[PDB]
Scaffold this motif. Structure first.
Motif, PDB file in Angstrom:
ATOM      1  N   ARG A 164      -0.670  13.449   7.913  1.00 25.67           N
ATOM      2  CA  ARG A 164      -1.942  13.029   8.300  1.00 25.67           C
ATOM      3  C   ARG A 164      -3.090  14.111   8.175  1.00 25.67           C
ATOM      4  NH1 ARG A 164      -5.170   8.712  10.501  1.00 25.67           N
ATOM      5  NH2 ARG A 164      -6.547   9.231  12.094  1.00 25.67           N
ATOM      6  N   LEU A 218      -5.179  12.871  -8.135  1.00 27.42           N
ATOM      7  CA  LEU A 218      -4.761  12.497  -6.781  1.00 27.42           C
ATOM      8  C   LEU A 218      -3.521  11.716  -6.738  1.00 27.42           C
ATOM      9  CD1 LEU A 218      -7.092   9.634  -5.554  1.00 27.42           C
ATOM     10  CD2 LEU A 218      -6.378   9.931  -7.972  1.00 27.42           C
ATOM     11  N   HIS A 219      -2.576  11.609  -8.030  1.00 28.45           N
ATOM     12  CA  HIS A 219      -1.568  10.927  -7.634  1.00 28.45           C
ATOM     13  C   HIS A 219      -0.517  11.379  -6.916  1.00 28.45           C
ATOM     14  CE1 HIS A 219      -1.139  14.045 -11.045  1.00 28.45           C
ATOM     15  NE2 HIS A 219       0.059  14.196 -10.715  1.00 28.45           N
ATOM     16  N   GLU A 232      -6.795  -2.183   5.684  1.00 30.13           N
ATOM     17  CA  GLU A 232      -7.686  -1.554   6.706  1.00 30.13           C
ATOM     18  C   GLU A 232      -8.538  -2.114   7.713  1.00 30.13           C
ATOM     19  OE1 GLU A 232      -6.487   1.701   6.970  1.00 30.13           O
ATOM     20  OE2 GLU A 232      -5.034   1.569   5.374  1.00 30.13           O
ATOM     21  N   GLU A 255      -2.700  23.414   6.495  1.00 31.96           N
ATOM     22  CA  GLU A 255      -2.261  22.714   7.489  1.00 31.96           C
ATOM     23  C   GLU A 255      -1.070  22.994   8.061  1.00 31.96           C
ATOM     24  OE1 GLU A 255      -1.904  22.423   4.157  1.00 31.96           O
ATOM     25  OE2 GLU A 255      -0.394  20.955   3.420  1.00 31.96           O
ATOM     26  N   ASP A 315       0.847  -1.188   0.074  1.00 36.85           N
ATOM     27  CA  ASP A 315       0.151  -0.056   0.041  1.00 36.85           C
ATOM     28  C   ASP A 315       0.917   1.260  -0.050  1.00 36.85           C
ATOM     29  OD1 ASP A 315      -2.104  -1.877   0.286  1.00 36.85           O
ATOM     30  OD2 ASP A 315      -2.314  -1.671   2.281  1.00 36.85           O
ATOM     31  N   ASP A 316       2.090   1.128   0.128  1.00 38.35           N
ATOM     32  CA  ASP A 316       3.114   2.222   0.105  1.00 38.35           C
ATOM     33  C   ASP A 316       3.257   2.927  -1.347  1.00 38.35           C
ATOM     34  OD1 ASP A 316       3.688   2.841   2.668  1.00 38.35           O
ATOM     35  OD2 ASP A 316       5.600   1.333   2.692  1.00 38.35           O
ATOM     36  N   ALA A 317       2.788   2.112  -2.334  1.00 37.29           N
ATOM     37  CA  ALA A 317       2.656   2.939  -3.542  1.00 37.29           C
ATOM     38  C   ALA A 317       1.660   3.933  -3.726  1.00 37.29           C
ATOM     39  CB  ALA A 317       2.090   1.710  -4.471  1.00 37.29           C
ATOM     40  N   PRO A 318       1.958   4.839  -4.758  1.00 40.78           N
ATOM     41  CA  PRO A 318       1.196   5.868  -4.872  1.00 40.78           C
ATOM     42  C   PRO A 318      -0.010   5.473  -5.632  1.00 40.78           C
ATOM     43  CG  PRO A 318       3.327   6.421  -6.223  1.00 40.78           C
ATOM     44  CD  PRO A 318       3.228   4.806  -5.471  1.00 40.78           C
ATOM     45  N   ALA A 319      -1.242   6.578  -5.333  1.00 41.20           N
ATOM     46  CA  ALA A 319      -2.321   6.177  -5.773  1.00 41.20           C
ATOM     47  C   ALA A 319      -2.620   5.790  -7.108  1.00 41.20           C
ATOM     48  CB  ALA A 319      -3.368   7.613  -5.495  1.00 41.20           C
ATOM     49  N   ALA A 325      -2.464  16.955   6.461  1.00 36.18           N
ATOM     50  CA  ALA A 325      -2.333  17.437   4.946  1.00 36.18           C
ATOM     51  C   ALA A 325      -3.057  16.596   3.791  1.00 36.18           C
ATOM     52  CB  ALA A 325      -0.885  17.862   4.762  1.00 36.18           C
ATOM     53  N   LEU A 354      -4.150   8.285   2.083  1.00 33.72           N
ATOM     54  CA  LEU A 354      -5.629   8.556   2.090  1.00 33.72           C
ATOM     55  C   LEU A 354      -6.641   7.717   2.447  1.00 33.72           C
ATOM     56  CD1 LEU A 354      -7.109   7.304  -0.931  1.00 33.72           C
ATOM     57  CD2 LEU A 354      -5.411   9.186  -1.633  1.00 33.72           C
ATOM     58  N   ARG A 355      -6.186   6.332   2.264  1.00 37.25           N
ATOM     59  CA  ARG A 355      -6.889   4.944   2.506  1.00 37.25           C
ATOM     60  C   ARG A 355      -7.071   5.034   3.930  1.00 37.25           C
ATOM     61  NH1 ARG A 355     -10.518   1.223   0.263  1.00 37.25           N
ATOM     62  NH2 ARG A 355      -8.994   1.239  -1.738  1.00 37.25           N
ATOM     63  N   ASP A 356      -6.304   4.991   4.701  1.00 35.65           N
ATOM     64  CA  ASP A 356      -6.280   4.745   6.057  1.00 35.65           C
ATOM     65  C   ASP A 356      -7.383   5.836   6.817  1.00 35.65           C
ATOM     66  OD1 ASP A 356      -6.147   3.770   8.601  1.00 35.65           O
ATOM     67  OD2 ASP A 356      -4.026   3.625   8.790  1.00 35.65           O
ATOM     68  N   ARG A 357      -7.123   7.141   6.308  1.00 31.75           N
ATOM     69  CA  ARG A 357      -7.980   8.273   7.007  1.00 31.75           C
ATOM     70  C   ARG A 357      -9.452   8.243   6.192  1.00 31.75           C
ATOM     71  NH1 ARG A 357      -6.961  13.679   7.832  1.00 31.75           N
ATOM     72  NH2 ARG A 357      -8.970  14.431   9.034  1.00 31.75           N
ATOM     73  N   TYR A 367      -5.784  18.624   2.411  1.00 26.22           N
ATOM     74  CA  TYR A 367      -5.385  20.166   2.042  1.00 26.22           C
ATOM     75  C   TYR A 367      -4.695  19.827   0.773  1.00 26.22           C
ATOM     76  CZ  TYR A 367      -7.296  21.458   6.568  1.00 26.22           C
ATOM     77  OH  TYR A 367      -8.134  21.786   7.604  1.00 26.22           O
ATOM     78  N   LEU A 408      -0.658  11.555  -3.496  1.00 18.11           N
ATOM     79  CA  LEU A 408      -0.528  10.947  -2.418  1.00 18.11           C
ATOM     80  C   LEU A 408      -0.440   9.436  -2.415  1.00 18.11           C
ATOM     81  CD1 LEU A 408      -3.668  12.569  -0.574  1.00 18.11           C
ATOM     82  CD2 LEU A 408      -1.432  12.648   0.288  1.00 18.11           C
ATOM     83  N   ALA A 409       0.107   8.754  -1.605  1.00 18.23           N
ATOM     84  CA  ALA A 409       0.330   7.386  -1.408  1.00 18.23           C
ATOM     85  C   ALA A 409      -1.107   6.684  -0.960  1.00 18.23           C
ATOM     86  CB  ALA A 409       1.533   6.972  -0.435  1.00 18.23           C
ATOM     87  N   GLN A 410      -1.169   5.521  -1.411  1.00 23.45           N
ATOM     88  CA  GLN A 410      -2.616   4.579  -1.121  1.00 23.45           C
ATOM     89  C   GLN A 410      -2.849   4.721   0.295  1.00 23.45           C
ATOM     90  OE1 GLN A 410      -3.107   1.028  -3.343  1.00 23.45           O
ATOM     91  NE2 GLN A 410      -2.535   2.047  -5.275  1.00 23.45           N
ATOM     92  N   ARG A 411      -1.981   4.310   1.215  1.00 27.57           N
ATOM     93  CA  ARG A 411      -2.225   4.313   2.845  1.00 27.57           C
ATOM     94  C   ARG A 411      -2.491   5.818   3.173  1.00 27.57           C
ATOM     95  NH1 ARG A 411       1.990   5.603   6.090  1.00 27.57           N
ATOM     96  NH2 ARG A 411       1.020   4.242   7.823  1.00 27.57           N
ATOM     97  N   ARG A 436      -5.551  21.493  -2.885  1.00 28.97           N
ATOM     98  CA  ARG A 436      -4.435  22.333  -3.499  1.00 28.97           C
ATOM     99  C   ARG A 436      -4.286  21.654  -4.819  1.00 28.97           C
ATOM    100  NH1 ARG A 436       0.773  22.101  -1.286  1.00 28.97           N
ATOM    101  NH2 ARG A 436      -0.056  20.497   0.456  1.00 28.97           N
ATOM    102  N   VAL A 486      -8.238   2.137  -5.463  1.00 28.40           N
ATOM    103  CA  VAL A 486      -6.908   2.446  -5.116  1.00 28.40           C
ATOM    104  C   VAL A 486      -6.859   0.787  -4.180  1.00 28.40           C
ATOM    105  CG1 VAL A 486      -5.522   3.705  -3.624  1.00 28.40           C
ATOM    106  CG2 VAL A 486      -7.498   4.809  -4.637  1.00 28.40           C
TER     107      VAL A 486
END
Lengths: 176, 63, 85, 45, 421, 295, 49
Positions: F63, F250-251, A85, C38, A64-68, F65, F258-261, F68, F253-256, F72, A76
């Motif tokens: 977490r 949305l590229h 999760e 932020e 999951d560390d990969a980019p979106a 940002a 936004l995904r965990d949030r 936001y 951000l890493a998957q985790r 942006r 995703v």
């Protein structure tokens, strides 16, 4: 009450397995409003190490560390990330007291004998009694650990707060 | 040295006229003992003037 | 009576050059400003923690000064007029 | 600034404002609105 | 019978020439006992000279000054009739307090709360009087918000008097901290203040009062700059020399209000100067959040009430002339929001009034700023503004305003009912 | 005869009680310590070095940002496309308009509106409210299915003559979320659920309340509106129905992160819900204080 | 809050009366008539809707 005692028992049965120690908490009219505490369905907690890594994963990262992905057939990491999760949240026990009370008077009405140092007795419109576990990486606690509080209602909406262990243990432990 | 800072907090900061020296107010000397210890709030000199004014007010009571 | 143009697909609104200049200038200002929200929140939490810790040191400094003054006063009393014990 | 339209001939507006949307626009109210927005924005390291 | 004193109150409050400096001494004193004790000789002169010069009772504009004149200024220096007028105002407040509760039935407490508090909101602490200078003794449900977060006691700070206090004077422009006197006012004074501001004042003034702030930070320094104030010991050269020595603004302010043949001009100005030592702080507007008593909570426990209150402020009844440069008008209530004063004090509010002349009413329909305009979460809804607009200026109107403050609690209904009210 | 854990637990009682706050300093809650918890028998260690706190605060910065940064990104895409097409933008939402008007004032109002929206960037917004269903497990298979079925050649005649019916992909009504900004009184509406339909007369969009009633925005000169589609298309529209469009990108951000949030919750079964999958449900249990408590 | 007060009045925009504000100008004898627009609100004596 009863949830605090029961969970303190239950964590002892699984201290070696989980490496988590029990933490007992009370919520009032300043964390969630009356109807939300009346209709609360679930409480969940999730641990975060000082490096910003969740505990449902090995420290050595995850795929999951990969980019979106931005794909459509994959959303995703569609199912994999969702199930990881769901792995990284643990469920806690809770009880709701739907009447106004004084916490010390309620606890002495119960079987306890609260032996606090002075009469800072406190009043509240209602109480819910949650309890959470926070993890011991080794037989030690890192002050920069972060612990998350999640609350879920029957409509599926949720509220989410996070606390760093130093404030909880500020001199509870350094004196010990 | 201390000449610069005391001249500054008398004439530049407080805008106090030159004839009002340290001799004409002992309380002024006792106050600059405190004033120069902090180098902030020098843009809003009105605060320093109001503090000096109220201090000289309380120093001049009957009781 | 009032007269108007009904909507379509290939009808277009032409911006003047001045508004394009203004909008791109504002975009550059936003990009270079670094006024991220932020950071506002992090700044607020930093002020809270610094305020707490500064208040925390203030009373400890006062306690140390009071202990020093008490010991000095005891020294003076024992030098000048020794009391019982 | 001006607007380029596919139909060369406009239509006269008819029927209520709750079945087709229309940007009615007296010039005075638009100027007043722009000034009010300008003052509102600035009025609200 | 107190009706002649009420007529004097009506003619002094509604007078277009209410003396100017009474506003300034209000924000100077804040109702602190020591400041008024210092100023007592000045105020005795001020009332005695004023009443003969103009047939109006001065310092009526604020509860604190009236009650302090009644209490401390009762030894002498006044003709006894004026002191009796102040005593009569305080007695009106006492009398309306007497009826406002249910004295025959209000024995005993309920849920660690007086039984009178349930009967009438006038005796309840959740209701903050619109003008406040001391925080109450009781803060059970109240959450006071200054910037955005309710004030954790670390935000609330005491103010020291006599001691050098430049950090507080720098903080004057700031908003988040609260600087307070170390006197948490009692519940009885709390009810008395509510009586004066909510019942008596909008009844007698017919809603035409208003609240304003004074720019003390810049006002006092140039008002009291001159060497006569700075240099003093531990004379009588000429009146023009004294006028030049105290300054044009001070001459326009004090010339023939607080000057007598026994305290000439510079002596009056110097005597007023002693008060500045407390100085206070800039004006702030507070909002208080509080759920109702544990009886009203049955329906909608959600309802965290919103009420707005002015701190370090003063209540005015006429538009200042000499202080226009140093003042801001604050409409914050459905009383104390007179369009005339606000339009006089600022250009843009006057533009708002002239563009919309229908807003020049006084029945509480004048638009309050959206921050203060949370009507449905307020205690005093529209009907109170309407009655105050219509109400004649007699003591019965004041008393029926307190009769209107009876609460809808089931226990309040029980108690009202048992008295066959 | 044995001592019981609960009895010594009660008789020992507690002596600790303090309030703690969340890191944002928004919520307070109480922590209680019992002198019979096994915590006291454990005698384990504690360490609170400054470097660990600094690292935790950096993790917290990320977490925070996470939202936001999407704000942006969409803002930067708006500006980049606005330069890309020369600023001259087509009509995309249908409403009648006048050629004899002061369009410059509406351009300046658009500038005001986008600035005011940028100030009021918040966690609740159409971009986040559209992202949240994208993260749910069904969205991958559902979008996969929608693309596959869209990617269908026109049926051969026997397919249409025989067997189960042919069907049409999308429903006539779309599901949208929007951000509404009004400049005349600084005010922004973010948590909006809104319905949209593409007109059959002209290929433009008509927007509706979640009642069937039409929206009022396009007529009002003092308002600008932002739109996002369930497939994360995007529009920024200023009065007259003229809009700027682009992808929601949305590229960044890493998957985790936004995904965990923003992981939408899914239930685990508890008393008062049917064991059959997704069946109809009674009114909620709601253990409440207005009634005499049951056992 | 105090310093911001003038900026609200700088905008030349009148505001709508609340329902509770409108309800206070219907005289007693015709509060019950059809012309009382607000009547659909008045469900409860103790409560505002």
């Amino acid at each position: 009450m009863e949830t605090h005692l029961y969970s303190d028992l239950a964590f002892e049965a699984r201290f070696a397995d989980d490496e988590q120690l029990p933490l007992h908490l009370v919520l009032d009219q300043e964390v969630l409003s009356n109807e939300e505490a009346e209709t609360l369905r679930y409480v969940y907690y999730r641990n975060v190490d000082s490096a910003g890594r969740s505990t449902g994963r090995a420290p050595g990262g995850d795929e999951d560390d990969a980019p979106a992905s931005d794909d459509a057939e994959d959303a995703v990491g569609g199912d994999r990330a969702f199930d990881r999760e769901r792995r990284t949240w643990q469920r806690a026990c809770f009880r709701v007291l739907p009447r106004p009370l004084e916490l010390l008077d309620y606890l002495r009405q119960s079987g306890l004998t609260v032996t606090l140092e002075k009469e800072q007795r406190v009043r509240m419109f209602y109480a819910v009694f949650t309890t959470l576990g926070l993890r011991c990486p080794d037989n030690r606690l890192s002050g920069a650990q972060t612990l998350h509080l999640r609350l879920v209602w029957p409509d599926g909406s949720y509220r989410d707060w996070e606390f760093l262990a130093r404030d909880l243990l500020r001199e509870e432990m350094e004196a010990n | 040295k201390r000449d610069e800072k005391h001249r500054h907090v008398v004439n530049v900061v407080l805008e106090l006229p030159t004839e009002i020296s340290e001799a004409t107010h002992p309380v002024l000397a006792t106050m600059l003992s405190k004033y120069t210890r902090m180098s902030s709030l020098f843009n809003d000199k009105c605060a320093f003037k109001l503090d000096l004014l109220r201090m000289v007010a309380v120093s001049r009571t009957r009781r | 009576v009032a007269v108007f143009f009904e909507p379509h697909e290939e009808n277009v609104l032409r911006c003047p050059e001045r508004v394009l200049r203004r909008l791109l200038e504002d975009a550059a200002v936003t990009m270079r400003g670094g006024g991220w929200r932020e950071d506002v929140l992090m700044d607020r939490v930093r002020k809270r923690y610094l305020r707490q810790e500064l208040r925390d040191l203030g009373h400890r400094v006062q306690t140390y000064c009071e202990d020093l003054e008490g010991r000095v006063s005891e020294a003076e009393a024992l030098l000048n007029q020794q009391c019982e014990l | 600034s001006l607007l380029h339209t596919f139909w060369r001939l406009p239509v006269a507006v008819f029927f209520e404002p709750h079945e087709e949307n229309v940007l009615r626009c007296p010039e005075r109210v638009l100027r007043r609105l722009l000034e009010d927005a300008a003052v509102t924005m600035r009025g609200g390291d | 019978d107190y009706e002649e004193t009420l007529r004097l109150f009506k003619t002094t409050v509604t007078s277009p020439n209410y003396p100017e400096l009474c506003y300034l001494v209000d924000v100077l004193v804040h109702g602190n006992v020591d400041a008024f004790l210092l100023i007592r000789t000045f105020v005795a002169r001020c009332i005695v000279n004023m009443f003969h010069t103009r047939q109006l009772l001065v310092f009526a504009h604020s509860y604190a000054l009236v009650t302090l004149i009644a209490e401390h200024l009762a030894d002498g220096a006044l003709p006894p009739q004026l002191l009796f007028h102040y005593r009569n105002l305080v007695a009106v407040l006492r009398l309306v307090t007497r009826i406002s509760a249910l004295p025959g039935l209000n024995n005993g407490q309920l849920a660690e709360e007086p039984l009178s508090a349930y009967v009438n909101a006038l005796h309840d602490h959740r209701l903050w009087p619109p003008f406040v200078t001391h925080l109450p003794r009781n803060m059970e449900g109240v959450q006071v918000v200054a910037d955005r977060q309710p004030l954790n006691p670390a935000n609330i700070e005491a103010r020291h008097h006599g001691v050098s206090d430049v950090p507080r004077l720098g903080a004057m422009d700031a908003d988040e901290p609260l600087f307070v006197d170390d006197y948490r006012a009692t519940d009885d004074e709390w009810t008395l203040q509510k009586v004066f501001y909510l019942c008596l004042m909008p009844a007698m003034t017919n809603n035409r009062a208003c609240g304003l702030g004074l720019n003390l930070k810049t006002l006092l320094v140039d008002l009291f700059y001159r060497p006569a104030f700075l240099l003093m010991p531990a004379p009588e050269d000429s009146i023009a020399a004294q006028r030049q020595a105290v300054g044009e603004m001070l001459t326009e302010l004090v010339e023939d209000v607080a000057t007598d043949a026994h305290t000439p001009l510079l002596q009056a100005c110097r005597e007023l100067f002693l008060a500045v030592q407390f100085v206070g702080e800039h004006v702030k507007v507070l909002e208080v959040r509080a759920p109702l008593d544990h009886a009203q909570r049955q329906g909608l426990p959600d309802f965290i009430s919103r009420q707005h209150v002015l701190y370090n402020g003063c209540c005015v009844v006429t538009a200042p002339k000499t202080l226009i440069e140093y003042s801001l008008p604050v409409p914050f209530h459905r009383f104390y929001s007179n369009p005339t004063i606000c339009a006089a004090l600022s250009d843009d509010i006057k533009r708002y009034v002239t563009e919309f002349p229908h807003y020049h009413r006084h029945d509480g329909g004048f638009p309050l700023p959206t921050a203060f305009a949370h009507e449905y979460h307020n205690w005093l809804r529209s009907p109170f503004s309407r009655y105050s607009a219509t109400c004649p200026n007699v003591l019965h109107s004041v008393m029926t305003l307190a009769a209107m403050l009876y609460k809808i609690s089931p226990v309040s209904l029980v108690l009202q009912t048992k008295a066959h009210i | 005869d044995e001592v019981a854990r609960t009895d010594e637990w009660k008789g020992a009682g507690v002596s600790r009680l303090r309030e703690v706050w969340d890191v944002q300093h928004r919520v307070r809650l109480r922590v209680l310590w019992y002198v019979n918890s096994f915590w006291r028998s454990r005698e384990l260690s504690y360490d609170d070095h400054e470097v660990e706190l600094y690292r935790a605060l950096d993790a917290y910065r990320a977490r925070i940002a996470v939202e936001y940064v999407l704000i942006r990104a969409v803002r930067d895409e708006i500006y980049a496309v606005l330069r890309r097409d020369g600023g001259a933008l087509p009509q995309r939402f249908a409403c009648h308009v006048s050629r004899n008007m002061s369009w410059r004032v509406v351009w300046e109002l658009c500038r005001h509106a986008l600035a005011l929206w940028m100030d009021w960037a918040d966690v609740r917004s159409c971009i986040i409210k559209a992202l949240t269903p994208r993260l749910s497990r069904g969205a991958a298979a559902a979008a996969q299915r929608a693309r596959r079925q869209r990617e269908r050649s026109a049926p051969k005649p026997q397919e249409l003559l025989f067997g189960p019916r042919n069907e049409s992909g999308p429903p006539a009504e779309q599901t949208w979320y929007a951000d509404v900004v009004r400049c005349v009184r600084a005010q922004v509406d973010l948590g909006v659920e809104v319905r949209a339909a593409r007109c059959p007369r002209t290929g433009l969009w008509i927007v509706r309340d979640r009642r069937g009633r039409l929206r009022r925005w396009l007529s009002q000169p003092e308002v600008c509106v932002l739109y996002v589609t369930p497939d994360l298309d995007f529009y920024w529209v200023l009065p007259g129905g003229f809009a700027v469009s682009s992808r929601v990108t949305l590229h960044g951000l890493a998957q985790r992160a936004l995904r965990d949030r923003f992981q939408n919750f899914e239930a685990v079964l508890a008393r008062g819900m049917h064991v059959e999958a997704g069946r109809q449900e009674p009114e909620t249990p709601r253990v409440s204080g207005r009634r005499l408590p049951f056992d | 809050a105090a310093r911001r007060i003038p900026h609200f009045y700088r905008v030349r925009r009148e505001v709508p009366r609340t329902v509770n504000e409108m309800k206070q100008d219907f005289v007693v004898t015709d509060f019950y008539k059809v012309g009382n627009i607000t009547l659909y609100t008045e469900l409860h004596p103790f409560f505002d809707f």
